[PDB]
């Protein structure tokens, strides 16, 4: 519509700017897409605009990288197996201040820019929180003027496209490069060899890794624009390519596929270590090519590796790139011929490690035999690291043999394994958790032994989200009513949102907050109708739980509440209840039968609830298909209630929680992860906090969790388990949910029933507030106004000062 | 050098043209290659110029295709499994008249354009003659203003890169898309489904092909510029892509490779049918996607399929796309619901078939079981075609049962097979050979039965080469001395070269012809030094045999001559002989042990000859590595003597013969293929014709070829076989050549020894003429001057008028 073109936060439609954009658009359509308007599809128009927008950061990208070469700052390398980037077109336009100019130029050409934006494929190179965190981090590091590089893998297929067929998840290949990627620049001239297998021989000079198989790593560079500071940083993603030279000639050519399979697809396993050789190869591939780049940049600067930690930070996003530690030692000792002790000093001062979960099944514990076959030299180095590290433990804690056994990089058993978390702590000068409660649990329990050896190593860095994608882009309406009162500085200084507490009693701001939410809901309600012919009641409370499907996130607890609301309506059909649209979305890991069963249960509950004429428009429950970064940008601004209901102690931080808080949703949740700090910032009176705290969970584990006690004492819970058992939600297959029932009653590691009573009552309080629109909106104002801490600019500023030793700067390039 | 910039045939360096080219060059380097001159490699500079040159044909390409849509001419579809295109940059510049402007613009930027041209990968999507013929044909059809489309497969790997290691061929993957292809435009929006396997069911309506596996065919469009007529035609190459939807999720994603393997690599088997399922899939893939395109274009024009043959010609390059015939019948009968007899009338009037060899092992004879599994509906249609075709044979030739058995599409035996040549003749209104002697043998022997049923079907179309790539581009020096005398019209009217017979006695032209040859030889001699550190004597006769390595091409006969020259020098070291550099090059099919042994024999003869101090610079024999279109453009203009020495009756035409004739080489050859017509055009007195004619070969077959008789009667031959046997050319492995010796003495299908005596004497006459430079050059003038018939413009004009029913035109577009 025109209205959106009038949005001040979207910048200026300069006459000359608009004229040049139209000309460059038409130029790309003719010379780049080789089409005239006669035959051009919306896809052609999307690509013409994407090429036009990309041209506007080429000068800045070249100048930024030239500026780092000349000024030689310390370089930050963010190593991750995942970059959950989403779409690039709107983000680029926001960060370059081109959004209103492009909007006007496309409008004058007869085009709806927002329809074109829907054509762009997500770069879905992530599973969830960790991947999206890497993405928010690249944006904040560019905005803070850091000389920062994202390093990862250019997966041919990202996280699988989820279809729901017969109420079940079906997985399809996320063919995101089908139509090409206008953002990336292939750098095949900067291709590097990566080695696999082979053997270690010992020459006059020392160890030599020989007889290896080569896979080439071909880098692809994507631009990362800072917010209006003329800074354009690089995300470098490596693509696997079969080496130059070699069933027959034909089979040998087809067999190039096996090496190229290394970058073929993202492992969709979110919170579970599988131990697949191909995943190990992906981890070594990204670490090996990346560290060659890092060493090359270091040596072409203003040799003596003493200065390497003053010019390089390597940040390990989880244990996935943990092989950086032995790889850096391998390069320094075997190729640069440093003494072991000097090499180790350099390695520890270079590397830092971010831990993202305490869940034991997440821990990377590679079989020694697999390491011995694939990476023989890395295994030798790991054993040497282990010897020297345990010698330090023995000196600090003389005769504490149990501690030596617990701290060892080597795990004894039927299969001997390397603990990659232990390797990361040993080879890193800093270890951080991703929220205060998580970082304290790391020092208290999980890494207590490591904390006692080296307390100075252990840090907190509470996660954050970029206010650019998660407010200005996704919710320009809310960004606009904020700018109208406090100006635009908050977009890169989010603590300025605290100025909004001055408007808790301002009739105009109260009106405007509620109006923006209603607009967002009408647009999302429309979306469901247009793309899925799904009708939702737009005067309903939007109750949203979007995140990966896991027992620990307790989508099942949400299911028990939804069926509780259904059964209360049936018992007292005459009694008024606040109408709800309950939306659950997210992907289940291919495999995880239980996660796939929970998706079927959500759709099955919907099948009953949504067709009961007594319920009608008072309650609707819908499974949002293919939850991904692009769909998060649509549903989160439309949300009234944010479900953050993980068992206390299980969610290290969460970032979806922060997105909802920034976009004018109230939160129902446990005192878990960053929920604790969110409630602290806003005041607990402005959060719907319920359920067991970590210490209540621990007291239940101490005496044993008996789900039967809850079943016996709670009539409403008993009625629901009996509906699930007897086939009420699967009449044509009455035993369909027996595995869910049996897990809840006898094998529930996440104590669903133990929080049921507090959850249902807490949800009653939510409904009671929603019936009072003014006080609902006033409480929302108090949440948005205190969301500033959860800016990833704040997080990155802390990494820069406390771990990397660099000073951030919002000062602009010319 | 500057001199080449002064070449009038290379066009004008307009001041504004040069200024715009430099600006667009710098523009591409910044916005396309994202590099500033600081860091730019010669590769960046090549790509910047390629993008700049490509931009200059975008308007013409769009207008040409729009012009065909509006004027609705009959469309020519040239279906081939091979397009042996070579490099595109220089060809584009020649056809757009930009060569001197680009040369000047790059010069002003401090760049050598010819060094940049060496960076471009050949599009090596061909094996040899048939593939390069398809390439010359696209060029001539554009130059003749035909509404012509090349349709083929976008192989990820073309013909293998040949390395010589220890004197043996080694094959490497021809990774021609490593750095990208600036010429092609991906059209993923015009992606089409191709079906494989499945089964035939019979509904109310008729046959239905069901339960198939889908492979997507994604088209890539390359421009084909005519010579300065503003015409830009299309080569559409299909890429295999796994369908949208589906060992586990991960194995299912990796298994997309199996479908994508269909377009992975060119079968390097030049003159041998192998019967590989994957080759059958490539043949159906190109035919199926192509015929969907053809039908779509037909229906979006100014339904009734009665007009289809008035608006479509399908030219089948060999039997490789022979499935077009049953596929067109399948579409017309099963999907468009035409009566069988009407469908057949349409199919025969649409399709024509070009035969390229009489060698039995070349004939495509697919097992019926393979067809039944992969293409069940095509097999049914082929059986129906066969029934109706043999019914016509039975009516024409009542009671001739032997003729029914010989003409059948179905070949009886242990394995029953479909003869694809028989299918092509049945389903085509025209059948042609590729030289007069070949086309007459087709009517006399191979297809005699078919000629007798339908004599009107059988045509000759003598092959040709484009005078653009094979004279103006590769030999601008010779193009220039010709233009100086007769102007530039000959470049698209090559019969104008006959005007050069007026200069046989012209002292200045004689001087200039010899000077251009000497320049070409000095440049090729330099090339060997720069790229291979190989020294050649530049006052030596350049004796060149470049072509695929096959027993029928008799590289071995050349080897016996080279060793004859070596042994004569050793016997009479004091006797003067014309110094020679004997150059043999070409690829052996992976497999063909004998072809690989012949390459080793050439290098082994070189190892002795090139290190014998008695011989010194008087005789050098070198194996030219990686013979391909780009290397043909270098060596052929430097050649003095063209070896075309195939056994009479074995080479259908040849095109290398024509390239040498156009570039000022004299020819030693058999009365075989187009050699016959070349000698007829120039006068036999201007050719070194030797050896058995077809009827002498036939008389030897009638009484039996006994190689021993030649061995017993020829002392010099006996001495050579004994050197090969005893290990003179393999001292460290004395029996290394026993298989070559045993084949020559007992299993020689190509009668090498039978032409030995005439060959050696004919070579004596060559040397005798070379000792007289004036008369050598005068005879060259008489060859170049009469090469005009062998223009592919002449060939295409004949296809257009005699088979396609369209009138050619050199008249320009605005
Ligand atoms: O930021 C948002 C928020 C939303 O709730 C929606 C958004 C974008 O775009 C969708 C959409 C789909 C299409 O298929 C279109 O063509 C189109 O223009 C917009 C739909 O309106 C819902
Ligand atoms: O048409 C011809 C004819 C030839 O005989 C040669 C040609 C081109 O280019 C080669 C060459 C190789 C390189 O590596 C270069 O850099 C370069 O400029 C030229 C070499 O001179 C030999």
**Looking at the partner chain, which of A186, A244, A265 has a beta carbon nearest the beta carbon of B250?**
A265
Q: Is A275 on the interface with B (CB under 8 A)?
A: no
Contacts of A43 in chain B (CB under 8 A): 189
Interface of A with B in 310-349 (CB under 8 A): none
How many domains does one find in chain A?
3
N- to C-terminal Cα distance for chain A? 34
Residues facing A315 on adjacent strands:
A78, A352
State the ligand closest to the CA atom of B1.
2
Whether residues A694 and A738 share a domain: the answer is yes
Same domain, A106 and A127: no
Q: Report the distance separating Cα A451 and Cα A457, nearest Å.
A: 7
Residues 221-240 of A with CB under 8 A from B: 221
Residue B657 lies in a domain: yes
Helix %, strand %, coil % for chain A, to 5?
55, 15, 30
CB proximity A70 to B under 8 Å: no
Q: Are B140 and B793 in contact (CB under 8 A)?
A: yes
| Assigned domain for B627 exists | yes
Any idea which residue has 């293998």 for tokens? B160
Looking at the structure, do residues A598 and A687 belong to the same domain, yes or no? yes
Scanning B2-31 for CB atoms below 8 A from A yields 30-31
Task: Judge whether A791 is annotated as a binding position.
Answer: no
CA of A247: which chain B residue's CA is closest? B591
The yes-or-no answer on residue A548 being catalytic is: yes
Backbone angles phi, psi at B80, to 5 degrees: -150, 145
Buried b or exposed e, range A334-355, using 16+ CB within 10 angstroms: bebebeeeebbbbbbbbbbbbb
Ligand-binding site membership of B80 (annotated): no
Which CATH number belongs to the domain containing residue B139 in this structure? Answer: 3.40.50.2000
**In whole angstroms, how far apart are CA A388 and each of A37, A363, A423, B161, B703?**
69, 23, 12, 51, 87
Q: Do A161 and A304 have their domain in common? A: yes
Place of tokens 């729901």: A164
- Taking residue B736's Cβ as centre, other Cβ atoms within 10 Å add up to 17
How far is residue A367's CA from residue A411's CA, in Å, rounded to a whole number? 9
> What is the distance between the alpha carbons of residues A608 and A611, in angstroms, rounded to a whole number?
6
The sign one gets for the Cα dihedral B619, B624, B627, B631 is negative
Q: What are the strands, taking DSSP E only, across B154-305?
A: 161-165, 168-172, 185-186, 192-196, 199-202, 207-210, 213-225, 232-241
Flag if B250 and A276 touch (Cβ within 8 Å): yes
A510: tokens are: 């109260």
Q: Are residues A14 and A135 in the same domain?
A: no
- Residue in B31, B186, B253 nearest the CB of A157: B253
Q: Which two tokens stand for residue B157?
A: 């790997």
Alpha carbon of A230 to those of A56, A73, B663: distances in Å? Answer: 11, 17, 57
* A314 contact partners, CB below 8 Å, separation of at least 6: A77, A79, A291, A294, A324, A328, A350, A351, A352
- The answer to whether residues B735 and B727 touch, using CB atoms and an 8 Å cutoff, is yes
Q: Which domain holds residue B133?
A: 72-87+122-464+797-804
Looking at the structure, tell me whether residues A540 and A600 fall in a common domain.
Answer: yes
Burial class, A190, CB count within 10 angstroms (exposed 0-12 / middle 13-18 / buried 19+): middle
Q: Residues in chain B, how many?
A: 814
> Chain A: residue nearest B257 by CA?
A257
- B486 domain-assigned: no
Looking at the structure, tell me whether residues A735 and A709 fall in a common domain: yes
How many angstroms is it from A230 CA to the middle of ligand 1?
Answer: 29
**Does B32 fall in a domain?**
no
Ligand 1: which residues within 6 Å by Cβ?
Answer: A 114-115, 118, 474, 523-524, 526-527, 530, 633-634
Residue B738, ligand 2, Cβ within 6 A: no
Residues A145, A196, single domain; the answer is yes
Residues B593 and B606: their CA atoms lie apart, in Å, by 20
With both helix axes pointing from N to C terminus, report the angle between A129-143 and A792-799 in degrees, rounded to the nearest 10.
80
Query: Do A79 and A114 share a domain, yes or no?
Result: no
Query: Of A392, A375, A377, whose CA–CA distance to A427 is shortest?
Result: A392
- Tracing tokens 């507030």 back to the chain, one arrives at A769
**Degrees to nearest 5, angle at CA B92 with B89 and B94:** 110
Q: How far is the CA of B541 from the centre of ligand 2 (A)?
A: 20
In a domain, B373, yes or no: yes
Interface subset of A 476-495, CB within 8 angstroms of B:
none
- Report the interhelical angle of A773-784 vs A507-532 (nearest 10°): 90
Measured from the CB, is residue B339 less than 6 Å from ligand 2? no
- Using CA atoms, how far apart are residues B650 and B140, in angstroms rounded to an integer? 27
Q: Does B645 map to a domain?
A: yes
Residue the block writes with tokens 């390491």: A371
d(CA B570, CA B563): 10
Nearest CA distance, A178 vs chain B (angstrom):
7
If asked whether residues A251 and A107 sit together in one domain, one would say no
DSSP state string for A757-796: HHHHHHHHHHHHHHTSHHHHHHHHHHHHTT-GGGBHHHHH
Identify the CA nearest to A554 among candidates A764, A706, A758, A364. A758
Q: Token pair 């120039």 is at which residue?
A: B682
Residues of B in contact with A188 (CB under 8 A): 178-180
CB of residue B527 inside a 6 A radius of ligand 2: yes
| Catalytic site positions of B | 356, 547-548, 553, 655, 659
DSSP three-state, residue B225? strand
Closest chain B residue by Cα to residue A41: B189
Resolution of the experimental model in angstroms, please? 2.1
Q: Which helix (DSSP H) or strand (DSSP E) does residue A85 occupy?
A: strand A83-86
| Residue A172 near residue A626 (C-beta atoms within 8 A) | no
Q: Is the dihedral of CA A403, A407, A408, A414 positive or negative?
A: positive
Q: Does residue A670 share a domain with residue A566? A: yes
SS3 of residue A149 by DSSP? strand
What is the rounded distance in angstroms from the CA atom of residue B342 to the CA atom of residue A321?
A: 66
Give the H or E element holding residue A494: none
Q: Counting beta carbons within 10 angstroms of the beta carbon of residue A520, is it exposed (0 to 12), middle (13 to 18) or buried (19 or more)? A: buried
Residue A766 lies in a domain: yes
Are B299 and B410 in a shared domain?
A: yes
Half-sphere CA count of A317, side-chain side, radius 13 A = 26
A785 contacts: CB under 8 Å, gap ≥ 6: A497, A498, A499, A500, A501, A504, A682
**Residue B513 resides in a domain:** no
Distance from the alpha carbon of residue A788 to the mean position of ligand 1, in angstroms? 27
The reply to whether ligand 2 has any atom less than 6 angstroms from the CB of B67 is: no
Which of A42, A190, A253 to substitute to test the interface with B, most B CBs within 10 Å? A253
């Amino acid at each position: 519509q025109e209205k959106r073109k009038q949005i001040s936060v979207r910048g200026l439609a300069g006459v000359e700017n608009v004229t040049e954009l139209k000309k460059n658009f038409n130029r790309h359509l003719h010379f780049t897409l080789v089409k005239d308007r006669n035959v051009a599809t919306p896809r052609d128009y999307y690509f013409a605009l994407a090429h036009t927008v990309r041209d506007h950061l080429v000068g800045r990208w070249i100048r930024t990288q030239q500026h780092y070469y000349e000024k030689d700052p310390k370089r930050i390398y963010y190593l991750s197996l995942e970059f959950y980037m989403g779409r690039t077109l709107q983000n680029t336009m926001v960060n370059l201040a081109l959004e209103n100019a492009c909007d006007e130029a496309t409008y004058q050409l007869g085009l709806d820019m927002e329809e074109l934006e829907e054509i762009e494929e997500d770069a879905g190179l992530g599973n969830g929180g960790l991947g999206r965190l890497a993405a928010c981090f690249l944006d904040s590091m560019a905005t803070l003027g850091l000389a920062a590089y994202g390093y990862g893998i250019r997966y041919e297929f990202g996280i699988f496209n989820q279809k729901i067929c017969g109420g079940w998840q079906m997985e399809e290949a996320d063919d995101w490069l089908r139509y090409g990627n206008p953002w990336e620049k292939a750098r095949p001239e900067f291709t590097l060899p990566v080695h696999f297998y082979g053997r270690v021989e010992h020459t006059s000079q020392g160890a030599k890794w020989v007889d290896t198989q080569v896979v080439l790593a071909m880098p692809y560079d994507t631009p990362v624009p800072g917010y209006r500071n003329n800074v354009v940083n690089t995300m470098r993603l490596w693509s696997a390519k079969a080496p130059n030279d070699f069933g027959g000639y034909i089979q040998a050519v087809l067999d190039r596929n096996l090496a190229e399979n290394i970058s073929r697809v993202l492992y969709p396993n979110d919170n579970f270590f599988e131990g697949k050789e191909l995943r190990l190869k992906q981890e070594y591939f990204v670490v090996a090519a990346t560290l060659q780049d890092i060493i090359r940049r270091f040596k072409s600067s203003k040799t003596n590796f003493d200065a390497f930690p003053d010019k390089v930070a390597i940040q390990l996003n989880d244990t996935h790139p943990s092989l950086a530690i032995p790889e850096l030692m391998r390069v320094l000792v075997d190729l640069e011929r440093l003494d072991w002790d000097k090499a180790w000093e350099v390695t520890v001062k270079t590397c830092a490690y971010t831990n993202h979960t305490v869940i034991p099944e997440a821990l990377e514990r590679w079989p020694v035999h697999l390491l011995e076959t694939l990476l023989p030299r890395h295994l030798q180095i790991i054993y040497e690291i282990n010897q020297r590290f345990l010698n330090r433990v023995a000196a600090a804690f003389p005769g504490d043999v149990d501690r030596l056994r617990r701290m060892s990089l080597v795990e004894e058993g039927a299969v001997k394994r390397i603990n990659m978390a232990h390797l990361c702590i040993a080879g890193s000068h800093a270890v951080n958790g991703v929220a205060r409660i998580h970082s304290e649990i790391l020092k208290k329990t999980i890494f207590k032994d490591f904390y006692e050896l080296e307390p100075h190593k252990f840090q907190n860095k509470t996660n954050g989200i970029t206010p650019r994608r998660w407010l200005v882009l996704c919710n320009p309406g809310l960004a606009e009513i904020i700018a109208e009162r406090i100006g635009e500085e908050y977009i890169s200084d989010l603590d300025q949102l605290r100025k909004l507490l001055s408007y808790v009693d301002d009739e105009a701001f109260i009106r405007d907050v509620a109006k923006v939410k209603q607009e967002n809901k009408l647009k999302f309600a429309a979306y469901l109708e247009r793309e899925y012919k799904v009708h939702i009641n737009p005067n309903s409370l939007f109750d949203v739980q979007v995140k990966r499907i896991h027992e620990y996130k307790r989508q099942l607890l949400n299911c028990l509440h939804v069926i509780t609301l259904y059964n209360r309506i049936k018992k007292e059909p005459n009694k008024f209840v606040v109408p709800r649209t309950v939306m659950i979305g997210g992907k289940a890991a291919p495999g995880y039968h239980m996660a796939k069963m929970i998706i079927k249960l959500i759709t099955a509950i919907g099948d009953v609830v949504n067709h009961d004429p007594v319920v009608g428009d008072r309650l609707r429950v819908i499974f949002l298909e293919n939850y991904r970064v692009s769909l998060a940008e649509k549903v989160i601004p439309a949300a009234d209630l944010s479900e953050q209901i993980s068992t206390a102690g299980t969610e290290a931080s969460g970032t979806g929680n922060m997105k909802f808080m920034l976009n004018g949703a109230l939160t129902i949740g446990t005192m878990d992860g960053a929920n604790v700090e969110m409630a602290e910032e806003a005041g607990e009176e402005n959060f719907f906090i319920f359920g067991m705290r970590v210490e209540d969970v621990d007291r239940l584990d101490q005496r044993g969790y008996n789900a039967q006690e809850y079943y016996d004492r709670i009539p409403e819970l008993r009625q629901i388990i009996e509906q699930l058992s007897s086939g009420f939600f699967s009449p044509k297959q009455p035993d369909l949910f027996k595995d869910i029932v049996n897990m809840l009653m006898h094998h529930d590691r996440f104590k669903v029933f133990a929080d049921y009573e507090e959850y249902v009552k807490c949800q009653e309080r939510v409904s009671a507030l929603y019936k009072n629109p003014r006080e609902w909106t006033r409480m929302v104002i108090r949440n948005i106004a205190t969301s500033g801490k959860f800016s990833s600019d704040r997080t990155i500023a802390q990494y820069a000062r406390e771990i990397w030793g660099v000073e951030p700067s919002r000062q602009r390039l010319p």
